[PDB]
Amino acid sequence: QVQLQESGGGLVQAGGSLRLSCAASGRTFSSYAMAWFRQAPGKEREFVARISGVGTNTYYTDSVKGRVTISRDNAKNTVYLQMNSLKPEDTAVYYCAASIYGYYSDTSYYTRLNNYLYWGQGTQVTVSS
């Protein structure tokens, strides 16, 4: 058995900063994959990051490399992201969810709605000027 929690979620204007996090309780996170997705208005949904509970073969968006911080801990089973100088292209709803897994090259093998143990609680980002 595991529990999930979400924090830091909020809406901040252009040139400001935003910090996002997901946390899990229990020691079996090595069989629960976290996945991050983005919904931009007028477009289809896209993937952002693929988080593996064993600490191996993780994926993330390279377009923000060195502009954001990404922190992950397999002892605590927690995830923290930090973002600075927000822009109009960041205007979206972000989602995080956790599903039962063993190993992957893509979270699409474990993105079934029955295999997600916990999902929703998305963060909308409202940008101005």
All structural domains of the chain, each given as residue ranges with its CATH number in brackets, are: 3-125 (2.60.40.10)
| Residue 26: how many other CB atoms lie within 10 Å | 11
| Residue 71: how many other CB atoms lie within 10 Å | 10
CA distances from 119 to 87, 96, 127 (A): 27, 7, 25
CA geometry: angle at 81 spanning 80 and 86, to 5°? 155
Query: What is the distance, to the nearest Å, from the Cα of residue 96 to the centroid of all Cα atoms in its chain?
Result: 5
- Interatomic CA distance for residues 37 and 55, integer angstroms: 20
